[PDB]
């Protein structure tokens, strides 16, 4: 995140951290995600595209730091990894960038409810906040586009939803942005999501609930002028989700 504040998981209890194991001894961070229900986490297909070996991913719930432990954290194994069929990327955008992970604990259980672990709510069929809405995004991603390391503490920031009309303008993203994506930016192009935040949530309130409205997906640079961050429009994938989380 560029800008933002540092937080703890008690402020984003639905955020999950996914890491990948390597032979040699290390586990490296991959992407962020969110918890929909006890056994299901949602993230972005591009996070798993280059290495779709579910056995090499670990999912942690209740985590405020990247490489050190938090008391209360739960560790999981990916039981089912579901990527999107019709996932494609171009020189920038990723289309149909949503994925589902079914988590299993080494004792055979799914997430359990604490003060650091909670589910986020889904939106209803193609229902979104109006452009203008301030939503917050969270994650362990870059702090500057030039950094080559991620922060150790969870960060968060507030961004506003912009319209398609403003985003598809030629001097922004043109037609790279489709109806199944959303754009979000800071009025003063000061904060944004960035490399390392992919898969994380974009949460806004809808009809009273804190709803997962978008998933961090792509963007040109970080906090650049007229280059909003682009998110998967979850309200338009509810059919898909449902088909697998039944």
């Amino acid at each position: 995140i560029i800008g933002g504040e540092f937080t703890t998981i008690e402020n984003q209890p639905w955020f999950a951290a996914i890491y990948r194991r390597h032979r040699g001894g290390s586990v490296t961070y991959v992407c962020g995600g969110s918890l929909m229900s006890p056994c299901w986490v949602i993230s972005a297909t591009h996070c798993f595209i280059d290495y779709p070996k579910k056995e090499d991913y670990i999912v942690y719930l209740g985590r405020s730091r990247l490489n050190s432990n938090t008391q209360g954290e739960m560790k999981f194994e990916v039981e089912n990894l579901i990527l999107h069929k019709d996932y494609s990327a171009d020189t920038l955008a990723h289309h149909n960038d949503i994925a589902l992970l079914k988590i299993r604990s080494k004792e055979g259980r799914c997430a359990q409810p604490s003060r650091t672990i909670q589910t986020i709510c889904l939106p209803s069929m193609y229902n979104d906040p109006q452009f203008g809405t301030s939503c917050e995004i969270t994650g362990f991603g870059k702090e500057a586009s030039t950094d080559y390391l991620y922060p150790e503490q969870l960060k968060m920031t507030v961004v506003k939803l912009i319209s398609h009309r403003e985003c598809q303008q030629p001097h922004y993203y043109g037609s790279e942005v489709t109806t199944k994506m959303l754009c979000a930016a800071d009025p003063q192009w000061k904060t944004d999501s960035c490399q390392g935040d992919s898969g994380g949530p974009l949460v806004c309130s809808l009809q009273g609930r804190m709803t997962l409205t978008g998933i961090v997906s792509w963007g040109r640079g970080c906090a650049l002028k007229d280059k909003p961050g682009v998110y998967t429009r979850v309200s338009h994938f509810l059919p898909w989700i449902r088909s697998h989380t039944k």
Binding site: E10, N11, S37, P113, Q118, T119, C121, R209, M210
Partner: peptide, 8 residues
């Protein structure tokens, strides 16, 4: 005492 999606 059980999940309540959206609650902190």
């Amino acid at each position: 005492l059980k999940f309540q999606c959206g609650q902190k």
